Design a protein around this ligand. Structure first.
Ligand SMILES: CCCNc1nn2c(-c3ccc(O)cc3)cnc2s1
Length: 337
């Protein structure tokens, strides 16, 4: 159905001519359009599936972005700018400023290579600043992941690197914006039991212990390590295995969280019910290892980044570093005058 209305050359709302598809998600797709009203300026138009779940998210997003874009009209805090919304053949469509590739797609197109540390520093700072602005306004994003962090411009330079015997892309400008506010939840609204894309999901969410702003900090930690390594650190699609990967990289879960959860199926006698000597078990043991062993250098700047990641990946959300504190971490000192 969407297929029929999202084609190159189609005109939306008597104004936006589709150029082609930028990306696709469970919610629908985002297409690049020429805005014939605004002199031909290109914009991004998100076309939402005509399915209750995604319509409701889209309506919620529209409310959240009107609030954020009004509170911060210049995008000082780097939330994407929504321009307008309309309906096309029964689909909600939301128009945004046109950005570049997601950080995820950039990594993927570069053969799953990591970003350079100086870029990670800048991107991390901006992600923290942006999501902290949400947290200051009684909001939790709940779905932070590299697909939802987009470069303002994703242009790169490309040269043969003799060291790794392959061509390699170097990002020119690492500035980012945060997108997708369809799951963003206010402190005083209903909190769904399940949030976040699995790989970025906090342990309090997996264990259904209740969540708030700290779950975003966990997701960010997962994003940073992925920017450093070039790959997803919890790539599994199974909750128990995910928890087993956590234990191998970060150590055992806190006993008090284990005791409090209603997800008894993961546990036996307050320990993860996980056979380490099963095949899945041996894979987890050989693929995963303690966090600091992932470091590619012992240089102090790498140590600083890993200290920050370690603090973001604190199991107990009440002890996890806040984004206000993260912005003052030494890893960011090089950014300051
Ligand atoms: C499909 C993966 C990306 N997901 C989303 N992208 N966006 C966008 C968006 C995408 C590309 C742009 O140039 C500008 C804005 C807005 N809301 C969302 S959810």
């Amino acid at each position: 159905s969407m297929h029929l209305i999202c084609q190159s050359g189609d005109v939306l709302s008597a104004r936006y001519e589709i150029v082609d598809t930028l990306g696709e998600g469970a919610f629908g797709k985002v297409v690049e359009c020429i805005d014939h009203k605004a002199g031909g300026r290109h914009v991004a138009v998100k076309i939402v599936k005509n399915v209750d779940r995604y319509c409701e998210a889209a309506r919620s997003e529209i409310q959240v972005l009107e609030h954020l874009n009004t509170t911060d009209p210049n995008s000082t805090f780097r939330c994407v700018q929504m321009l307008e919304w309309f309906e096309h053949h029964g689909h909600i469509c939301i128009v945004f400023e046109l950005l570049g590739l997601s950080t995820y797609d950039f990594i993927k197109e570069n053969g799953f290579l990591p970003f350079r540390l100086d870029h990670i520093r800048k991107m991390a700072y901006q992600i923290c600043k942006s999501v902290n602005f949400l947290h200051s306004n009684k909001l939790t994003h709940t779905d932070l992941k590299p697909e939802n962090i987009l470069f303002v411009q994703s242009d790169y330079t490309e040269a043969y690197n003799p060291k790794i015997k392959r061509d390699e892309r170097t990002l020119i400008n690492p500035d980012i914006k945060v997108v997708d506010f369809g799951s963003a939840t206010y402190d005083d609204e209903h909190h769904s039991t399940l949030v976040s894309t699995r790989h970025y999901r906090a342990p309090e969410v997996i264990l259904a212990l209740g969540w708030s702003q700290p779950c975003d900090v966990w997701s960010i930690g997962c994003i940073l390590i992925e920017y450093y390594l070039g790959f997803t650190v919890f790539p599994t699609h199974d909750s128990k295995e995910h928890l087993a990967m956590m234990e191998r990289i970060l150590g055992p879960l806190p006993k008090h969280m284990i005791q409090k959860t209603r997800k008894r199926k993961y546990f036996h006698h307050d320990r993860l019910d996980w056979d380490e000597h099963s095949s899945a078990g041996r894979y987890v043991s050989r693929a995963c290892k303690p966090l600091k062993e992932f470091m590619l250098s012992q240089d102090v700047e790498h140590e600083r980044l890993f200290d920050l990641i370690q603090k973001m990946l604190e199991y107990d959300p009440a002890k996890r570093i806040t984004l206000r504190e993260a912005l003052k971490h030494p890893f960011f000192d090089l950014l300051k005058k």
